[PDB]
Amino acid sequence: DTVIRTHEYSNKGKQYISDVTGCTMVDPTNGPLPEDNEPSAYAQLDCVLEALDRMDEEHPGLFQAASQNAMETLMVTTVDKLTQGRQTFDWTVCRNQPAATALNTTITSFRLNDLNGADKGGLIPFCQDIIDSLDRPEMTFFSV
Amino acid sequence: SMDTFITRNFQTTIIQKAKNTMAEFSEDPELQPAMLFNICVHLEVCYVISDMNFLDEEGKAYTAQNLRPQYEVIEGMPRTIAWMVQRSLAQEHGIETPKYLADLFDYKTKRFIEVGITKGLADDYFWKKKEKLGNSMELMIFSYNQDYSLSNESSLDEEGKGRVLSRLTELQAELSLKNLWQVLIGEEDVEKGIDFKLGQTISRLRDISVPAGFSNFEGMRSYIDNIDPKG
Amino acid sequence: LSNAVAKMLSNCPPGGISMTVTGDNTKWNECLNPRIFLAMTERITRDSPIWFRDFCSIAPVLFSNKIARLGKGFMITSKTKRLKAQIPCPDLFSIP
Amino acid sequence: YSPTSPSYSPTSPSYSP
Amino acid sequence: MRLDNATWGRITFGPVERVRKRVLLNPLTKEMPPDEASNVIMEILFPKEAGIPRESTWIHRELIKEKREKLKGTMITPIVLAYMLERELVARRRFLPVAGATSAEFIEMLHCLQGENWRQIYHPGGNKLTESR
Amino acid sequence: KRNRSILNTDQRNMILEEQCYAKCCNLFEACFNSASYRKPVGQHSMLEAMAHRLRMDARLDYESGRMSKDDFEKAMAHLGEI
RNA sequence: UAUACCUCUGCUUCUGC
RNA sequence: AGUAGUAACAAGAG
RNA sequence: AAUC
């Protein structure tokens, strides 16, 4: 129902095929504006950027200030920060499991495909491994 | 190069520990090999002092059987392991833990030792580190030009003092032979830029993950940064 | 909210009318697009270095090409025979 | 006086001619 | 001990304007930031693991010595001692609706102090600070 | 008590996997008591840490005189294998 | 097949920010 | 049957 | 006469 209704509000957008996944994708952004009161995902990029600009004018140098605080925190953030979560999807077994386990299964699996950014302690190199793991031609994982 | 040079001179035990120490400070071994050499030489001087030296059941120095050395090598080991050893000794013998990290601890002297390697004047480098410590650790500085400046209470034996000065200039001779001595003399400091670059697959996803009227992400990045939408 | 309401109340033009719209947005998640959220980060990280810009850009890029797993499936039963069986999501179009 | 009693209340400001 | 030695006044019925101010929930033995207290706790319970000795050690050296002597002959698990110390060092400051009482030893009793349409006089026992007076 | 439904499924294998980590962690906490309180830091091996600590602990207990000549050699022998 | 009038299970056949 | 209410339970497994 |  959600899957249908999500596309029902974006059906007048641009439909294309993802060359990566090979899936059917839908893009409403910068689509034709609505002529009815039915829900609409057709949001114009300029109107967002203007409203964002208006925020930077009203609140001076908040963006670069907020970016700094987050960026500086990211550097200090350890990998174990991903343990404090709820039931997480584990790609290895394709079932929901505790975040602490779902993390451990990924670290042990990444060690086989040769991605030891997790060992360094910081989240940045572990995140650097995750985007790189897409490039690997085959991803091996333990299955007891 | 300095990279291939260290493979021939030192053993793996000194190379690994040197790289592992630099890894903690977020300093690249390969991009700064002269900085690795400073630690490699600094660890080898400390290693040889504790190698032949041992203790007995009565508790006096002798050369070699036994499973309890006379000197405890702190430099080379990781930070959290080093500071564990640092405090455990200080707390046991009953003396104040030093402000900064140490290199060696002599069980017969019951005092911390601060080792230092320098290029030119050895006596100049001795008084510089005396400012910070004062009377915390017994300093023992050495240089490559056979110029030494030991502590007031000289625990170092005459035969052992030679082995240090022997290896110091032997390496300094090997460096000058292959024209790799000029690399260590010159100054070395570069910014550790935080590297995070996107691969092939994730970049391909970001290219398609853009609004209508954009070829690739580069177009979306420049547009948001440059143009002014007001009105 | 008290102070905000006090100010938004007492700042209003005298001899006018201040009106409060008790509001709510329907189909919040179903409409909002990741590609708009991507544009938001690029604007917010304009002064910040290029490594951080690309870092913040990933999360939306992943949501932009996300895939939905359709739970367990559908259970079919004969009332006369008194039988039941789950139909896995890959076998949804196996049945007419 | 008990809190339930009316006499518990304080001798309040009363008006006079 | 504060509730034990305390004396209670009289309940007054009438309006009470309440302000929502960021107050300290529990009285501390000696206030410190999270980092500074964490190290003081380390020096007391786990000396050898502690790590790089900061100046903070020498500032609260008198507290460390005192806590060690008090936590000497106890069989209770360190993790419990650390937790109980962390309580009486790290600050617990959160927004509460108050009216003429912001001192922690009042805030801990804030439920019995006043409501919207009533007030109650309460003298908390033990000691009070000069700064607070 | 733990949910025992796992015993009947093929997930059983995770019970061993848990109790394995449990042993290691519980033995690490026996070497480093502060591990329970504040998160241990280090990019080095978990064994390397436990080795160097138990080495020092034995050496200092001997020189102080908590450890005997019978126990010290046995201790250095066992740690010698690692 | 059979053990099985036996054995195991009661949130662990998907519970997010 | 009944609970219940857009889909289940009214026992499951070796 | 606050910040934490």
Which of F28, F31, F52 is the best residue to mutate to test the B interface, defined by the most B CB atoms within 10 Å of its own CB? F52
Strands B104-106 and B111-118 come out as: antiparallel
Residue B106 lies in a domain: yes
Instruction: Give the CA angle between residues A48, A50, A53 to the nearest 5°.
Output: 110
Strands B137-143 and B111-118 come out as: parallel
Range of the domain at F52: 1-82
Q: Do chain F and E touch: 3 or more Cβ pairs under 8 angstroms?
A: yes
CA dihedral E107, E112, E114, E115 (to 10 degrees): 110
- Confirm or reject contact between A76 and chain B (CB < 8 A): no
Distance of CA B165 to the CA centre of its chain: 20
- Confirm or reject contact between E11 and chain D (CB < 8 A): yes
Q: How buried is residue E6: exposed, middle or buried, by Cβ count under 10 Å (0-12/13-18/19+)?
A: middle
CATH number at residue B82: 3.40.91.90
Instruction: Provide the residue type at B78 as one letter.
Output: P
Residue B192 lies in a domain: no
Would you tell me the crossing angle of helices E78-87 and E34-45 to the nearest 10 degrees?
Answer: 140
Q: Could you tell me which residues of chain F have a Cβ less than 8 Å from any Cβ in chain E?
A: 32-34, 36-38
- Size of chain A, expressed as the number of residues it contains: 144
d(CA C39, CA C50): 15
State the total domains in chain F: 1
- Confirm or reject contact between E52 and chain F (CB < 8 A): no
E53 Cβ within 7 A of any nucleic strand I atom: no
Subunits touching D (CB < 8 Å, at least 3 pairs)? E
Nucleotides of G under 7 A from a protein CB: 8-17
Residue E9 gets which letter from DSSP? E
Instruction: Calculate the angstrom distance between C1' of H9 and CA of F38.
Output: 47
The answer on whether C11 is annotated among ligand-binding residues is no
- Size of chain F, expressed as the number of residues it contains: 82
d(CA A33, CA E125): 70
Of B231, A42, B219, residue with least CA distance to C42: B219
d(CA E51, CA E48): 7
Instruction: Calculate the angstrom distance between C1' of G5 and CA of B49.
Output: 80
Of B77, B76, B103, residue with least CA distance to B10: B76
Instruction: Give the CA angle between residues B188, B190, B194 to the nearest 5°.
Output: 150
Of C67, C68, C66, C58, residue with least CA distance to C37: C58
Contact at CB, F60 and B89, closer than 8 angstroms: yes
Instruction: Give the CA angle between residues B73, E49, F76 to the nearest 5°.
Output: 50
Give the nucleotide at minimum CA-to-C1' distance from C72.
G14
* Residue reference for tokens 């020498």: E58
Q: How buried is residue A56: exposed, middle or buried, by Cβ count under 10 Å (0-12/13-18/19+)?
A: middle
For residue E65, the surrounding DSSP H or E stretch is: helix E61-70
SS3 assignment, position E26: coil
d(CA F19, CA C71): 31
Rg (CA), chain B: 25
Q: Are B18 and B36 in contact (CB under 8 A)?
A: yes
Q: Are A120 and B194 in contact (CB under 8 A)?
A: no
Of C58, C54, C95, C53, residue with least CA distance to C75: C95
Instruction: Provide the residue type at A46 as one letter.
Output: D
Instruction: Give the CA angle between residues F16, F19, F24 to the nearest 5°.
Output: 125
* Residue reference for tokens 């830029």: B193
Cross-strand bridge partners of residue B53: B63
> What token pair was written down for E88?
């009486």
Residue B107 makes CB contacts below 8 A (sequence gap 6+) with B55, B59, B70, B71, B72, F63
The answer on whether C51 is annotated among ligand-binding residues is no
- Please state, as a whole number, how many other Cβ atoms lie within 10 Å of the Cβ of residue C57: 21
d(CA E85, CA E80): 9
* Residue reference for tokens 């019925």: E13
State the total domains in chain B: 1
C4 Cβ within 7 A of any nucleic strand H atom: no
- HEC string of chain B equals CHHHHHHHHCCHHHHHHHHHHHHHCCCCCCCCHHHHHHHHHHHHHHHHHHHCEECCCCCCCEECCCCCECEEECCCCCHHHHHHHHHHHHHHHCCCCCCCCCCEEECCCCEEEEEEEECCCHHHHHHHHHHHHCCCEEEEEEECCCCEECCCCCCCCHHHHHHHHHHHHHHHHHHHHCCCHHHHHCCCCCCCCCCCCCCCHHHHHHHHCCCCCCCCHHHHHHHHHHCCCCC
Q: Which residues of A touch F43 (CB under 8 A)?
A: 119-121
- Confirm or reject contact between B221 and chain C (CB < 8 A): yes
Q: What phi, psi does E10 have (nearest 5°)?
A: -135, 145
Residue C23 gets which letter from DSSP? -
Strands A24-27 and A14-17 come out as: antiparallel
Q: Report the half-sphere exposure of C19 (CA within 13 A, side-chain side).
A: 4
Q: End-to-end CA distance of chain E: give it in Å, rounded.
A: 21
Which of C57, C63, C67 is the best residue to mutate to test the B interface, defined by the most B CB atoms within 10 Å of its own CB? C57
The answer on whether B56 is annotated among ligand-binding residues is no
> What token pair was written down for C11?
């700042």
Distance from CA of B2 to the nearest CA of E (A): 33
Which of E12, E118, E119 is the best residue to mutate to test the D interface, defined by the most D CB atoms within 10 Å of its own CB? E12
Range of the domain at B133: 2-185
Question: How many CB pairs lie under 8 A apart between chains B and C?
Answer: 45
Residue B231 lies in a domain: no
Instruction: Give the CA angle between residues E1, E3, E8 to the nearest 5°.
Output: 145
d(CA A89, CA A91): 6
Of B195, B201, B231, the CB nearest to A134: B201
Of C56, A45, A12, A10, residue with least CA distance to B210: A45
Resolution (A): 3.1
d(CA F72, CA F55): 10
Distance of CA A13 to the CA centre of its chain: 22
| Cα-Cα-Cα-Cα dihedral sign, residues B108, B112, B118, B121 | negative
Instruction: Give the CA angle between residues F54, F59, F65 to the nearest 5°.
Output: 120
- What is C47-67 written as a DSSP string? SS-HHHHHHHHHHHHHHHT--
Strands B62-63 and B53-54 come out as: antiparallel
- What is chain F written as a DSSP string? ----GGGGSGGGHHHHHHHHHHHHHHHHHHH-GGGTTS----SS-HHHHHHHHHHHHHHHHHHHTSS-HHHHHHHHHHHHT-
Q: Are E114 and E56 in contact (CB under 8 A)?
A: no
d(CA B210, CA A45): 10
> What token pair was written down for F39?
């998160």
Of B57, B107, B109, residue with least CA distance to B85: B107
- Please state, as a whole number, how many other Cβ atoms lie within 10 Å of the Cβ of residue F42: 14
d(CA A14, CA C60): 19
Largest Cα span, chain D: 32
